[PDB]
Amino acid sequence: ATVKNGTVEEMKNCSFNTTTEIRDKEKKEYALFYKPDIVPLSETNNTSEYRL
Amino acid sequence: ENLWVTVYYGVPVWKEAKTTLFCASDARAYEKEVHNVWATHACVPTDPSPQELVLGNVTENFNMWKNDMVDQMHEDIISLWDQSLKPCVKLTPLCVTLICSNATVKNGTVEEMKNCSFNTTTEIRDKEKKEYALFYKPDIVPLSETNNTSEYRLINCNTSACTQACPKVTFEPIPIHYCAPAGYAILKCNDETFNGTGPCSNVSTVQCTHGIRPVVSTQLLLNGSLAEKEIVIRSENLTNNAKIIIVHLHTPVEIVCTRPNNNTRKSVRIGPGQTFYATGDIIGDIKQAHCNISEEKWNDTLQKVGIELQKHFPNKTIKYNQSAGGDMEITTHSFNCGGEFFYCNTSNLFNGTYNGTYISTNSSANSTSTITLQCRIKQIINMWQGVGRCMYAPPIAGNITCRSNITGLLLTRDGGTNSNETETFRPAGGDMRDNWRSELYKYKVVKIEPLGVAPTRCKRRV
Amino acid sequence: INCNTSACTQACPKVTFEPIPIHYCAPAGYAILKCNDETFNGTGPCSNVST
Amino acid sequence: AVGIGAVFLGFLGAAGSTMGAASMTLTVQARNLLSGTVWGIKQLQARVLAVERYLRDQQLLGIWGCSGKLICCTNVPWNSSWSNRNLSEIWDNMTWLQWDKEISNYTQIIYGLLEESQNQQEKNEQDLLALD
Amino acid sequence: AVGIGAVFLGFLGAAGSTMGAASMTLTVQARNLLSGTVWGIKQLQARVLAVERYLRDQQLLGIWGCSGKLICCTNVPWNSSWSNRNLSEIWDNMTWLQWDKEISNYTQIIYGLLEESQNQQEKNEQDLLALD
Numbered sequence A: 001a002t003v004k005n006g007t008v009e010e011m012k013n014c015s016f017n018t019t020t021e022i023r024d025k026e027k028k029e030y031a032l033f034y035k036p037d038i039v040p041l042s043e044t045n046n047t048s049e050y051r052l
Numbered sequence B: 001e002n003l004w005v006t007v008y009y010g011v012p013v014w015k016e017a018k019t020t021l022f023c024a025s026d027a028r029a030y031e032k033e034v035h036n037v038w039a040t041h042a043c044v045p046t047d048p049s050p051q052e053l054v055l056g057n058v059t060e061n062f063n064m065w066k067n068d069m070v071d072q073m074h075e076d077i078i079s080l081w082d083q084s085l086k087p088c089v090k091l092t093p094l095c096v097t098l099i100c101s102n103a104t105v106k107n108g109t110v111e112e113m114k115n116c117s118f119n120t121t122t123e124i125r126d127k128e129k130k131e132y133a134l135f136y137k138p139d140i141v142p143l144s145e146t147n148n149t150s151e152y153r154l155i156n157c158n159t160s161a162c163t164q165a166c167p168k169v170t171f172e173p174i175p176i177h178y179c180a181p182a183g184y185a186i187l188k189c190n191d192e193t194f195n196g197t198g199p200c201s202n203v204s205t206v207q208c209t210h211g212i213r214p215v216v217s218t219q220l221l222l223n224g225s226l227a228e229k230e231i232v233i234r235s236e237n238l239t240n241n242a243k244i245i246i247v248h249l250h251t252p253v254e255i256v257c258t259r260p261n262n263n264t265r266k267s268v269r270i271g272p273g274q275t276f277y278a279t280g281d282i283i284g285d286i287k288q289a290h291c292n293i294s295e296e297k298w299n300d301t302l303q304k305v306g307i308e309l310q311k312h313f314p315n316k317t318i319k320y321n322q323s324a325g326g327d328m329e330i331t332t333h334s335f336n337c338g339g340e341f342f343y344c345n346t347s348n349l350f351n352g353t354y355n356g357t358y359i360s361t362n363s364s365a366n367s368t369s370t371i372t373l374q375c376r377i378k379q380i381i382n383m384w385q386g387v388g389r390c391m392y393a394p395p396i397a398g399n400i401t402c403r404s405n406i407t408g409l410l411l412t413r414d415g416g417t418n419s420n421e422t423e424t425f426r427p428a429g430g431d432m433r434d435n436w437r438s439e440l441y442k443y444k445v446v447k448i449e450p451l452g453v454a455p456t457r458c459k460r461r462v
Numbered sequence C: 001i002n003c004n005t006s007a008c009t010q011a012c013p014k015v016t017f018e019p020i021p022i023h024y025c026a027p028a029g030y031a032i033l034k035c036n037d038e039t040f041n042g043t044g045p046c047s048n049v050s051t
Numbered sequence D, E: 001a002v003g004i005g006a007v008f009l010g011f012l013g014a015a016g017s018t019m020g021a022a023s024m025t026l027t028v029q030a031r032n033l034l035s036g037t038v039w040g041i042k043q044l045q046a047r048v049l050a051v052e053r054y055l056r057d058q059q060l061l062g063i064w065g066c067s068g069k070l071i072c073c074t075n076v077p078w079n080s081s082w083s084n085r086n087l088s089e090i091w092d093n094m095t096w097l098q099w100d101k102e103i104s105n106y107t108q109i110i111y112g113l114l115e116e117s118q119n120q121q122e123k124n125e126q127d128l129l130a131l132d
């Protein structure tokens, strides 16, 4: 998303496939995470895959 | 004449007090395994010696509904059932899309069991194999609002994770004796007509309480103590009908229940090294589960109960009626039998009236006459709230029988209307405190104060 | 050779299998009697008893 | 009657009986301050609570000068304001279980009286036995 | 010999020695009733069990009138049917460890006798000290 100022932080919007309460029938779900609690997954050029 | 303060020790003085109690089993509770029955585990072998003692000149207040002993009984059984279900397999791979078939009985008098199939994580994990098992219909729900009538889910997986009951632990109630610790005593009210709240003019004392059957039952009180002389009723405030009434029977009513279906077991692997037992076949013809009560006894018994109920409602005659209505576990009489859990529709029993007019039992024209309750079976159980509630009781092979004695009723009046001459009573099961309180009413815990001061004609020697 | 009979667990690397010597001590009110005879066979009256 | 022979009154046999009958055969109550074995943590706690209680009673009794576990005549004179009642009023038909309802109010006074009155006794023997 | 000087016999030194030798220096056995610290629940259980036993012995010795922890002469007359044996037969070459095999049968009689006898004793002082 877009803030462009740097004085305020935003929260990163992340989405994920969830093992729901009936196990083997997934559904995608999203939540906001503070940036210190999220890290990129790999050294690869993909700037859109993250890990806690 | 002069007197001096003289101090005595070993005085027979006490005050009522709060404290923990031991639990003690009968002598034959230790040939079994660990945790089976719980009487082997939480309790000590009891010594019947010394026996009861009667105190010759003392009177004391006994208050059944304020007794903390049942309040500790509740915590004891809760923690003791919670303990047992720790090592047992906590299911969880069974929260999957179960695909089930229609079956065919076409009558409605008998149920079938739904045949459901599911993909299983084998004991080598990631190499699945489809497997099927029979499930009682109350334990299965459709998965979604969609039009697919062939995809089902267990009643678990929405509210809580659930655990199988181990096969090496049994549900049968071994009698439990509550014993007092040092410095305390238990007072037994020997008055055989005591109502529940008032001064007992004949007070005994015993080393330990007599055996209690921790039998869980909702509407009726199965195997337990019988009234000494007559039917006695107990309630805090009969004017406000919301309070439960305990009826205590002198003459028992015999009840027998059966499951004629010859079920056969099946085994399924759930991850590495652990098994989930299930029903795989029904040998023979499918038939209805039921309980049989003799009409010749029930008809006598309920008017015998009517004369006792007349006394605190003398203005009005009596009629009996169906429960208040609600969910299965709320409305139906329920009990355990050999490991299975039954739920009986009890509308046939609570029917009829009494107007101070006794009807004869002699001659009993038909002792083979019966009234048949119809009962349903479940395997997914919510036995207490907050005890780690869900438990899956595995099926038991063969056919089973449930003979026992009825010894009391739990009831609740309906609201009055029209100032009617014939107001009515309903059954009311509920909190299991009311079940144990029906049998712990004889006892109270006290604390011995052996130190006392008195005036006397003797002084110190210098 | 797991997965058929039972689930299995790794032994931690910060715990060792080496037997450290163990001394069994008596509680208060009890005593341990040592048969001081140097040829005792295993069942019978020890004619020299220490504590 | 108190002429029992070999005692068989049981634990609380004299409850409701006379003060004199309960005053003889006091040991049947004193000896029984013990019971139990252990499951978990709670029953062991119940075990140690009894020892706490027994040692409380023994210490309080001993500070008054009562090593004996049955009866003591004490130096403290009687304050008659507590009942102003006769010997037969208190002794001949009452029981200890009904006596405790009356003077339990004044136990917290008598305890301090006894506690100090032992010190007005034993300090003097500390002087006389030096004079001897 | 029992002329030890400063005592060094240890815990159970007089085991197998004469009744007289074991009768002197009884404290070396009595004093050794304290030990332990805790791992888990079973060790604290073992700790409290020792206190239970110690208070058993101390109480039962107390109701007999024996506040002293070594020896007592008691008012119970001797019943000679228990052994009908001489003083040298019992005292001069036996030890306590083999004396316990004989009269352990009759301990449960002597205990009740002593228990009642202390009550015949101390009730009289409750009267005599009032007559004084």
Ligand SMILES: *[C@@H]1O[C@H](CO)[C@@H](O[C@@H]2O[C@H](CO)[C@@H](O[C@@H]3O[C@H](CO)[C@@H](O)[C@H](O)[C@@H]3O)[C@H](O)[C@H]2NC(C)=O)[C@H](O)[C@H]1NC(C)=O
Pocket (backbone or CB within 6 Å): A001, A013, A014, A015, A030
């Ligand atoms: C964070 O990201 C999530 C997606 O991962 C955002 O949720 C999405 O929000 C949009 C806009 O409201 C939803 O689209 C709309 O859906 C309705 C469905 O009725 C449709 O009629 C509209 O035309 C429109 O397409 C979208 O459904 C929703 N995603 C999910 C899975 O529900 C969320 O808004 C983001 N939040 C922030 C603060 O960036």
Ligand SMILES: *[C@@H]1O[C@H](CO)[C@@H](O[C@@H]2O[C@H](CO)[C@@H](O[C@@H]3O[C@H](CO)[C@@H](O)[C@H](O)[C@@H]3O)[C@H](O)[C@H]2NC(C)=O)[C@H](O)[C@H]1NC(C)=O
Pocket (backbone or CB within 6 Å): B115, B116, B117, B132, B281, B282
């Ligand atoms: C509940 O449903 C299951 C299926 O989910 C039923 O099991 C199936 O029963 C049939 C009839 O016995 C089996 O078919 C037969 O298999 C033998 C194999 O030798 C073959 O020779 C026959 O020609 C016939 O096809 C079928 O294999 C079996 N399914 C599995 C997976 O074993 C079960 O009978 C149903 N039970 C009830 C009470 O409805």
Ligand SMILES: *[C@@H]1O[C@H](CO)[C@@H](O[C@@H]2O[C@H](CO)[C@@H](O)[C@H](O)[C@H]2NC(C)=O)[C@H](O)[C@H]1NC(C)=O
Pocket (backbone or CB within 6 Å): B399, B400, B401
């Ligand atoms: C399984 O069913 C059989 C047949 O109904 C039961 O056998 C009867 O049991 C009763 C006791 O309740 C006896 O009085 C009968 O003589 C038995 N035989 C018949 C033909 O009725 C059997 O008890 C049931 N199994 C269990 C465990 O109760």
